């Protein structure tokens, strides 16, 4: 029994198939001009001239409602946030206020950092980000890399996101890490924005949300 549980803990010959990983970091396509079943799963607002900002606000609200329509638990306000730097005009509150008009802006080094620190082991399943290519082209995020880990010490690369034209909410469920659970299990998530569109300098963040599974008398 002792030997067998060690073997289950440490499978020597059982696991390693050929040891032939390609080792390149996998790249995710975010374009919204091609219609596919997989993209529809990750892209919610639907594929479509540039819409007017009031149309962007309208579709911003509809995407929030659609994402919240399904059986879900929102724990966006259940974690600590620490961006790389402020600009004294708008903290991350306007990023997490679920309002298109307001937004958060960083100001500092080019490799902008957004830190998400958790208090308890929460199993995130759907990662939601809203982008606005036409509304914020100057500060649009063009290159996104999402990390993972249990602590600031052991942060590791998870996925790439290249932005070409996404004027809507982006849903990011995770399946590569754990196929059995179809969800991510970490306590430490950080985001990087190393470069912007048309050689930008800073970056806004219109929306951000975290998803987890589980008449009257006045």
């Amino acid at each position: 029994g002792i030997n067998k549980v060690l073997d289950h803990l440490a499978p020597s010959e059982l696991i390693k198939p050929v040891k032939s990983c390609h080792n390149k970091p996998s790249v995710l396509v975010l374009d919204d001009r091609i219609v596919d079943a997989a993209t529809k799963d990750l892209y919610v607002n639907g594929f479509q001239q540039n819409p007017t900002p009031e149309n962007l606000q309208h579709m911003f609200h509809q995407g929030i409602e659609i994402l919240d329509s399904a059986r879900m638990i929102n724990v966006t306000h259940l974690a600590l946030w620490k961006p790389s730097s402020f600009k004294l005009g708008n903290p991350v509150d306007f990023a997490l206020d679920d309002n298109y008009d307001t937004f958060w802006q960083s100001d500092g080094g080019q490799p902008h950092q957004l830190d998400i620190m958790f208090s308890k082991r929460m199993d995130i399943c759907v990662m939601a980000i809203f982008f606005s290519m036409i509304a914020d082209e100057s500060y649009a995020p063009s290159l996104v890399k999402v990390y993972a880990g249990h602590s600031p010490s052991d942060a590791r690369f998870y996925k790439m996101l290249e932005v070409r034209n996404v004027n809507g909410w982006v849903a990011l469920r995770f399946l590569d890490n754990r196929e059995d659970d179809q969800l991510l299990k970490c306590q430490f998530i950080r985001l990087l924005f190393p470069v912007n569109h048309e050689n930008g300098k800073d970056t806004h963040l219109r929306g951000i949300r975290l998803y987890v599974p589980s008449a009257i008398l006045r």
């Binding site: 002792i2 060690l6 289950h8 390693k16 040891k19 080792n23 958790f118 290159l143 993972a148 010490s153």
Partner: protein, 743 residues
């Protein structure tokens, strides 16, 4: 040859490719990995050479610079250059490590090393080598009173390495003197202890960690409330770096070890109220569960709180505190679990060290209450706590049986390392859950090798060397066989993983051959366990926290080597069998242990008697009673001298009392012929030729020459009728000849 650092390093490369460009890239990658190895050989070279070279004072010291140039079997040399090939900080970090090794090489009892000597050896240009060298002299106990003249000269540049070396070495030299003139200097260095509201002065974070560890170690056994409460506040509070608030895991680990070392041995209480208040506050920190992350109590202080509770009740056998500290696997695997998993290793290690009488030597203690209990036996994050569980238990087990050696523990670790070795550094299916679990595997296998080295220290074992050699060689990882800054970070993570893997194997190689094998670690004195536990702290993951503390085990190394010397000649005699009486590390009665002469005997307090027996020198057997111990007996010196018997003709007057075995006679004849090959030339043969071999017979022959008065006649009769003597029968015949022979 494997562990030396001042020379090109022999490398082995796989390169399972045929294209020339791909082969060159892998060779360059292996060259970068070998540069990491050359940087980290500081930890190993410190242990290989503890007290080898002695100083002459007048002679000027020299520090060999890092070579970090690799040589392949094809002899196509590839040279690593900074910061193009490797991270820039790594090269002078290795220089600092090599300097610490160089400083510690000087012996403890060496005299003439005053404040002027270090200034005389100053290179006139501050670098990592001199800071490390300065740290080594300070750590050995030489900076007892360093003059204030050139303290400012050293500290005037803001270079971190020299400042770190100066702070740590000097604090280690006084080691608990509570002197004002030096504690005030670090107080100036530490930003948080500086008076509130003062304008911030730029001080590096690593420098702050270096200063705080020196203060705690400076305040060893002080039991000083005014500093301990401030230190406790330091662990809980938040820091300021670059005018913005920052929370550091590195600084809090330093604060935790600081609090533990200052109040070492203060927990054996049956001050008590204040100790109870501090104990319950630390337990509150370690046990508090927060659904929402508080800013000023993050999880980074959990290890410090846990490490602090380690030193409060060290070697106290307080079952209750251990139970509230010890974590049960069956309960936690049922639940989702909380906090960083790495805390579990430290918690169980702390709980096991508290009960310093039941550290199990069997696999059952290691394998206690562990079961996978899930259908999915594939590597998943859910079974990380058991790996950290395993790591803590074996680390406590290894430190408990430190340098005493054993066979069952060695065999268990051999089985464990054989089982866990193949999984090591295998990025087969690149999945984040799998990658995190196998990173824990890398940490676990680093711990098993280090612990296996700890139990078998100073013995030069074969299989432990076999395992540590393998961990040393072959980089493995994603490359070989088994957006620019983004690629830089991707390569930085892998290179740091290799650096962490290399420090562990180097520590094992150094510990195996400690002081050329004639020095061993001490775990008798209470603070020795503190330094040993402090130095073995597993910090192999990024960013390798508190690495500069790795060269502190030198406080625990002490001689314990027994050799035999002759008295008359005054020279050493070797290769004589020695029988030893021990307690078998248990309550059993005794087992005879036969060893050669230059062998490391076990701890003196556990030895009851020692005897030397060998053909030739007459035997010497000493039994140690309760009154005098082996340590007190060897206090004057670890060498016991033996007297030389005598092959004298006068000893064998007439009869040979000796058995005179034919085998030993032939061996002696062959040995004498060997010297003769490489006769009446000896004085014994002269006295044999003269015929005065029998002392008593010649004297009585002279006496009887003439008379024979009555008194001497009765005297000769008494010697003849002696109860015990030698040539009695020969003596009887002469009186008969004198009395009734021809005349």
């Amino acid at each position: 040859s494997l562990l030396a650092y001042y020379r090109p390093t022999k490398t082995q490369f796989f390169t399972t490719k045929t294209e020339y460009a791909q082969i060159l890239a892998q060779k360059k990658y292996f060259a970068k990995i070998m540069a990491l190895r050359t940087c980290t050989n500081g930890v190993g070279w410190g242990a290989v050479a503890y007290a080898t070279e002695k100083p002459i004072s007048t002679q000027k010291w020299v520090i060999q610079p890092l070579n970090l140039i690799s040589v392949f079997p094809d002899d196509t040399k590839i040279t690593v250059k900074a910061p193009e090939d490797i991270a820039h900080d790594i090269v002078e970090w290795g220089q600092f490590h090599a300097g610490v090794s160089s400083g510690l090489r000087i012996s403890k009892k060496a005299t003439g090393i005053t404040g002027s000597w270090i200034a005389f050896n100053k290179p006139k240009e501050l670098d990592a080598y001199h800071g490390g060298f300065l740290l080594g002299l300070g750590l050995n106990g030489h900076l007892k009173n360093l003059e204030e003249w050139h303290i400012y000269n050293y500290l005037s540049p803001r270079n971190t390495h020299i400042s770190i070396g100066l702070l740590l070495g000097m604090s280690s030299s006084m080691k608990g003197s509570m002197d004002s003139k030096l504690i005030k200097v670090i107080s100036v260095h530490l930003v948080a202890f500086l008076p509130s509201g003062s304008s911030d002065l730029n001080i590096d974070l690593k420098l702050q960690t270096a200063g705080i560890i020196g203060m705690g170690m400076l305040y060893l056994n002080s039991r000083h409330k005014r500093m301990s409460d401030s230190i406790f506040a330091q662990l809980v509070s938040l820091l300021n770096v670059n005018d913005e608030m920052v929370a550091d895991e590195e600084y809090r680990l330093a604060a935790g070890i600081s609090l533990g070392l200052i109040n070492l041995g203060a927990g054996q209480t049956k001050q008590n109220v204040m100790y109870e208040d501090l104990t319950t506050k630390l337990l509150e920190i370690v046990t508090s569960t927060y659904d929402v992350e508080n800013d000023w109590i993050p999880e980074n202080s959990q290890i410090g709180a846990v490490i602090a509770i380690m030193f409060l009740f060290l070697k106290s056998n307080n079952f209750g505190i251990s139970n509230m500290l010890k974590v049960d696997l069956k309960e936690i695997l049922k639940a989702n679990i909380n906090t960083r998993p790495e805390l579990l290793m430290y918690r169980e290690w702390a709980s096991n060290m508290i009960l310093w009488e039941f550290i199990g030597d069997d696999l059952s203690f290691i394998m206690k209450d562990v079961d996978i209990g899930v259908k999915f036996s594939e590597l998943n994050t859910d079974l990380l706590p058991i790996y950290y569980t395993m790591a803590g238990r074996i680390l406590a087990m290894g430190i408990r049986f430190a340098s005493t050696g054993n066979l069952k523990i060695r065999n268990i670790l051999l089985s464990l390392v054989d089982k866990f070795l193949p999984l090591y550094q295998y990025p087969g299916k690149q999945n984040l859950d799998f990658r995190l679990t196998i990173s824990v595997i890398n940490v676990l296998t680093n711990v098993i090798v280090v612990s296996l080295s700890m139990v078998m220290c100073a013995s030069g074992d074969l299989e432990v060397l076999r395992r540590v050699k393998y961990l040393h060689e072959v980089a493995s990882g994603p490359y070989s066989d088994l957006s620019d800054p983004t690629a830089y970070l991707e390569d930085k993570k892998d290179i740091d993983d290799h650096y962490g893997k290399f420090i562990s194997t180097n520590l094992a190689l150094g510990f195996l051959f400690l002081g050329s094998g004639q020095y061993a670690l001490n775990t008798s004195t209470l603070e020795s366990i503190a330094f040993l536990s402090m130095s073995v702290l597993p910090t192999y993951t990024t960013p390798h926290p508190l690495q500069e503390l790795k060269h502190f085990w030198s406080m625990a190394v002490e001689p314990r080597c027994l050799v035999i010397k002759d008295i008359s000649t005054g020279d050493a005699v070797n290769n004589v069998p020695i029988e030893l009486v021990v307690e078998e590390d248990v309550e059993k009665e005794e087992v005879i242990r036969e060893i050669s002469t230059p062998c490391l005997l076990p701890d003196f307090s556990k030895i009851k008697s020692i005897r030397v027996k060998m053909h030739g020198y007459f035997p010497l057997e000493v039994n140690f009673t309760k009154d005098y111990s082996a340590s007190d007996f060897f206090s004057g010196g670890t060498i016991i001298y033996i007297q030389r018997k005598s092959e004298s003709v006068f000893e064998n007057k007439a009869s040979f009392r000796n058995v005179e075995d034919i085998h030993v006679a032939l061996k002696r004849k062959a040995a004498e012929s060997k010297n003769y090959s490489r006769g009446n030339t000896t004085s014994s043969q002269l006295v044999e030729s003269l015929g005065i071999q029998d002392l008593t017979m010649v004297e009585l022959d002279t006496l009887l020459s003439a008379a024979l008065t009555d008194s001497e006649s009765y005297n000769l009769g008494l010697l003849c009728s002696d109860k015990n003597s030698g040539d009695i029968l020969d003596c009887q015949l002469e009186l008969w000849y004198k009395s009734f022979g021809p005349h």
